[PDB]
Design a protein around this ligand. Structure first.
Ligand code: T44
Ligand code: MYR
Ligand code: MYR
Ligand code: MYR
Ligand code: MYR
Ligand code: MYR
Ligand code: MYR
Ligand code: MYR
Length: 582
């Protein structure tokens, strides 16, 4: 078209356009105040209006990058505030935009955003719905300059829905609080997965990423042909490369193109893309990204046919290794939506190591004849962990299950910081209550998704302040061995316990008036500290101590004289427990 702005304005709609422009500016000028971004938005919107009325109006012909940069270079304090960035204004596009990208600070130093009280929240929402939402949108956008703008807007509307429904409720807190926590965790998970995918693309290269994509895409679209799946894997890879570089406009267009491509070839890909494809421009991508797996053909052959028997195997493999291997992935992955993607990759890698060390020997057909027998234990390892851990999770509840993990992991890597152990364990705990609820068919994909961020999170922390070569080992290994490596950790035989510390095991009647989340974190913290002092303690010896402690919290949070009870009965507990634990 003659005018890009006019065009975007038209299919985006005034509301969406204003919110995205706001997010876009907040992600670059992370230091400017809200009121100043609001002024920019209005001027840009006003300008956009002009181009809608007359495509040929002054400056309407210029591209989005160009218009964005000139307005960005409009800020008078650019140099005094952003310094180096102001120098970007001296060069011409595309260098200018490229220059701006390099100065976007991923982790700026802004105070943590605190959650105000439900009533001040609900009142602000009522008295001025828009500024309340645009202000937080801004605060969130400046802290996460790389979070895909449209997705951030998508979260904003769910937040609005949560305030509309909950602020009219009798008990606003019972309604609103659990929704905010869910929203928050979900957002944090989306950011981590986004950062994770880009990191992975960097370290392991395109091949590994494409492999992951083939397996992922063939589980969702088991009916699409391999050539279609390859086409999508290609564009999907260009899209992520471009979106990871951080250029919003380029990323958005790449996603829109890919979204429409899929919709126009709907019948040739999946039967579940119906809804997603009749939605507005701004939502297609997101929807398609979250679609459910289509049903498989059920009239599908046996993998063994074309991959084990057929004597044409090494010939087909030598002619195009990656293609053949991709086909293997596609074929194995679309018959197994129940496998985690990394499991599919472990099988693909194993098959690869076999074809290599078998196509270079006498009679191929006999060397690789039993490959499928090596798959069996690879498949069963994760499954066994799911049943085993999910059973235990039912015997105990979420909380007691978390404690079990705490005892198990503290013994594994005693070197790790207590607060880290507690946090990781609690998160592992959730994964249990959020995945064991599904039927066996979806349990593994579930755990993989959740475990991938929890694990990368853990690794990053350890990255900053390393404390164990073993953790570092598991953390710097390939993405397919990460989880198995952590599972293989054994109790630390060399670890030398910490000396007793009265304080660490002293507790006042503070825990009585704390919220469940607080009471637990405190009990769990002492628990990690307990195992660190006496790591050779039995599951029993420990259970006994956690027992005396359990009641102890009752006999003191229910006695007319707290503090005294806690300090009197507390002396007993420590003395007795110390003896039981020799
Ligand atoms: N330690 C945090 C709590 C927290 C627990 C989990 I478990 C978690 O991980 C996921 C992963 C996926 I995938 C999801 O869809 C969701 I929702 C949460 C995240 I992020 C945060 C705190 O209390 O501050
Ligand atoms: C996302 C953009 C919309 C923001 C809506 C306001 C959410 C309440 C802010 C609470 C801080 C986040 C938290 O820690 O729960
Ligand atoms: C469409 C061609 C891409 C398929 C490439 C097949 C590679 C299979 C090996 C598994 C990859 C895991 C990543 C890795 O360990 O390098
Ligand atoms: C300046 C205006 C920003 C334009 C953003 C358009 C985003 C389009 C959504 C595409 C998608 O992700 O499917
Ligand atoms: C995941 C964000 C990228 C959005 C790309 C939309 C294109 C449709 C492919 C969606 C298939 C899901 C595969 C995946 O997890 O990336
Ligand atoms: C607590 C729940 C733990 C989940 C069990 C481990 C399963 C991991 C599947 C991912 C993989 O294939 O490595
Ligand atoms: C520090 C704590 C590291 C513990 C990593 C937990 C890995 C989860 C896989 C489940 C398992 O087999 O234990
Ligand atoms: C040196 C030993 C001192 C004894 C310290 C006791 C700490 C154990 C707290 C564990 C709490 C288990 C949680 C629960 O009661 O449900």
């Amino acid at each position: 078209h003659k005018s890009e702005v006019a065009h975007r304005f038209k299919d985006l709609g005034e509301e969406n356009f204003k919110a995205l422009v706001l997010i876009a500016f907040a992600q670059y000028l992370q230091q400017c105040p809200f009121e100043d971004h609001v002024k920019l938005v209005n001027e840009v919107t006003e300008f956009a209006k002009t181009c809608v009325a007359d495509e040929s109006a002054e400056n309407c012909d210029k591209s989005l990058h160009t218009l964005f940069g000139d307005k960005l270079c409009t800020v008078a304090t650019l140099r005094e505030t952003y310094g180096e960035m102001a120098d970007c204004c001296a060069k011409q596009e595309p260098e200018r935009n490229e220059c701006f990208l390099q100065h976007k600070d991923d982790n700026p130093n802004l105070p943590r955003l605190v959650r105000p009280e439900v009533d001040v929240m609900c009142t602000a929402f009522h008295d001025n719905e828009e500024t309340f939402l645009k202000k937080y949108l801004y605060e969130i956008a400046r802290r996460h300059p790389y979070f895909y703008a449209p997705e951030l807007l998508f979260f904003a509307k769910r937040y609005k829905a949560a305030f509309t429904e909950c602020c009219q409720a009798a008990d606003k807190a019972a309604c609103l609080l659990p929704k905010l926590d869910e929203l928050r965790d979900e957002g944090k998970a989306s950011s981590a997965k986004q950062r994770l995918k880009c990191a992975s693309l960097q370290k392991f290269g395109e091949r590994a990423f494409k492999a992951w994509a083939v397996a992922r895409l063939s589980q969702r679209f088991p009916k699409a042909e391999f050539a279609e799946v390859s086409k999508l894997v290609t564009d999907l890879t260009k899209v992520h490369t471009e979106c990871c570089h951080g250029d919003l406009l380029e990323c958005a267009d790449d996603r829109a193109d890919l979204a429409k491509y899929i919709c126009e070839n709907q019948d040739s890909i999946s039967s579940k893309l119906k809804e997603c494809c009749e939605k507005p421009l701004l939502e297609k991508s997101h929807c398609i990204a979250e679609v459910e797996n289509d049903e498989m053909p059920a009239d599908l052959p046996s993998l063994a046919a074309d991959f084990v028997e057929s004597k044409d195997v090494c010939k087909n493999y030598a002619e195009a290794k990656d293609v053949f291997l991709g086909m293997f992935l596609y074929e194995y992955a679309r018959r197994h939506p129940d496998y985690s993607v990394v499991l599919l990759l472990r099988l693909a890698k194993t098959y690869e190591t076999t074809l290599e060390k078998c196509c270079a020997a006498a009679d191929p057909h006999e060397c690789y004849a039993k490959v499928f027998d090596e798959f069996k234990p690879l498949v069963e390892e994760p499954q066994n962990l799911i049943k085993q851990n999910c059973e235990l999770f039912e015997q105990l509840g979420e909380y007691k299950f978390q404690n079990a993990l705490l005892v198990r992991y503290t013994k594994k890597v005693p070197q790790v910081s207590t607060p880290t152990l507690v946090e990781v364990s609690r998160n592992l705990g959730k994964v249990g209550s959020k995945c064991c609820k599904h039927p066996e068919a979806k349990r593994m994909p579930c755990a993989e998704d959740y475990l991938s961020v929890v694990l990368n999170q853990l690794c990053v922390l350890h990255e900053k302040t390393p404390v164990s070569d073993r953790v570092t080992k598991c953390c710097t290994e390939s993405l397919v061995n990460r989880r198995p490596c952590f599972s293989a950790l054994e109790v630390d035989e060399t670890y030398v316990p910490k000396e007793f510390n009265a304080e660490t095991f002293t507790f006042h009647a503070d825990i009585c008036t704390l919220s469940e989340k607080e009471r637990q974190i405190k009990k769990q913290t002492a628990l990690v500290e307990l195992v660190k002092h006496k790591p050779k303690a039995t599951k029993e010896q420990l259970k006994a101590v956690m027992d005396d402690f359990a009641a102890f919290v009752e006999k003191c949070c229910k006695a007319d004289d707290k503090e005294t009870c806690f300090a009197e009965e507390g002396k007993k507990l420590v003395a007795a427990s110390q003896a039981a634990l020799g």
